[PDB]
Design a protein around this ligand. Structure first.
Ligand SMILES: Nc1ncnc2c1ncn2[C@@H]1O[C@@H]2COP(=O)(O)O[C@H]2[C@H]1O
Ligand SMILES: Nc1ncnc2c1ncn2[C@@H]1O[C@@H]2COP(=O)(O)O[C@H]2[C@H]1O
Lengths: 197, 197
DNA sequence: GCGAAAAGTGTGACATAT
DNA sequence: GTCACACTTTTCG
DNA sequence: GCGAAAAGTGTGACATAT
DNA sequence: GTCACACTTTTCG
């Protein structure tokens, strides 16, 4: 509703899966809102693998870290998980629309507050938990991340050892090793699709 | 500014060094604004180890992350590093001030945005950089934080091996072990306080 | 809902940073 | 990373 | 700006997780 | 955590 008004100033572009919709290092001018799809925010090692900072789904804004100060660079990469419809407005336009109705600025700040909250958790987990525990937290969370199919006894997620590695911070084969251990303990069942039972 | 209008309906309180303002887990109901002094935002593991998420200094809001969603716990501990003159507003009342003037909700959300920006970076260092690199980036950044004294040529910061330990995520012992490595390498000069070249 | 081309994976011996 | 310990440093009354 | 208690520390041989 | 390669599994035209 306030959303529809917002969306009316926006221009929906379509992006297929694997699209890198934002890239770290360019300048920020556009605030993006996910009409449809799921996206993955990433940062890349100083000459190497990348780590996934979070999945953002329909209803999230992307880009915003620029919005508040001029000449701001994009902080991370945002690649499409799935095919997405991205409603954009520019920042200038967003500012006018701020003054016209504060409620987008509120729902966006709410989003900002959550990302900080969960990323503070991620600093915590990177510092206090061992890889096994990180992989446990992650399957727990992924069964909660809105795209796990119900499993009569369990929740089923499609995920690759490589993706879990990139979330966690360890080799795809390290992930492998541990997923084998959690299967032997009758906690997890897997084959490209894993069930967090 | 907008600032003074805000502050007039805040109960200004004074915290001594080491006083714990926020305990993580408390119910969020009050936003704070640091009028004078410095605070450290930290999280601890159930078996005792604690990590500093950031030092917040005057001019920063403390306790923002509950303002947006009804009934949340405080996300981290905020302990006063120094004598702090801290302003306090009821959440319900701050809500009112936003409707009355959006520029404070703007100044605030800006602060949370820069915070999302630095906390994603701290996730990045933990995941990507070994302790030497992490302590390196630390000595560097501390030498830009407002309290770094100059030491003719070079910066001078006073920070115990303890603290850096809590910033980087390794034992005070290891912090020592590597600071000397950085002394042999001619980059750090140390004796209780450090002069980062 | 095919089937070729692509993508993800397990293995075991090893070092190695905190 | 850990351990215990005496050792060095800094704090301030 | 003196000194005594508090706060910080280095050692060294070590175990271990990814 | 590493290396590589054979194998298995998923993608997509
Ligand atoms: N830690 C994070 N958690 C969630 N989203 C993030 C995080 N860091 C960056 N982003 C989002 O990804 C975007 C990357 O560049 P921007 O600065 O445009 O704005 C960023 C946010 O929209
Ligand atoms: N990553 C962070 N950087 C800075 N401050 C933080 C961070 N995480 C939490 N905080 C602050 O610590 C406060 C804890 O309580 P709140 O969740 O109300 O609000 C939180 C923020 O003000």
């Amino acid at each position: 509703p306030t959303l529809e008004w917002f969306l009316s100033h926006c221009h929906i572009h379509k992006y297929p899966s694997k699209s890198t919709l934002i890239h770290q290092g360019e300048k920020a001018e556009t605030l993006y809102y996910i009409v449809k799809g799921s996206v993955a925010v990433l940062i890349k090692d100083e000459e190497g693998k990348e780590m996934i900072l979070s999945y953002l789904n329909q209803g999230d804004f992307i880009g915003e870290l620029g919005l508040f100060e001029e000449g701001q660079e994009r902080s991370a990469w945002v690649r499409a998980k799935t095919a997405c419809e991205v409603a954009e407005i520019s920042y200038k336009k967003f500012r006018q629309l701020i003054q016209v109705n504060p409620d987008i600025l509120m729902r966006l700040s709410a989003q900002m507050a959550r990302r900080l909250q969960v990323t503070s958790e991620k600093v915590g987990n990177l510092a206090f938990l061992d890889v096994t525990g990180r992989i446990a937290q992650t399957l727990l969370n992924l069964a909660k991340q809105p795209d796990a199919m119900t499993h009569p006894d369990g929740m089923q997620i499609k995920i690759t050892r490589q993706e879990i590695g990139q979330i966690v911070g360890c080799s795809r084969e390290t992930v492998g090793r541990i997923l084998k251990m959690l299967e032997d303990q009758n906690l997890i069942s897997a084959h490209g699709k894993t069930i967090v039972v």
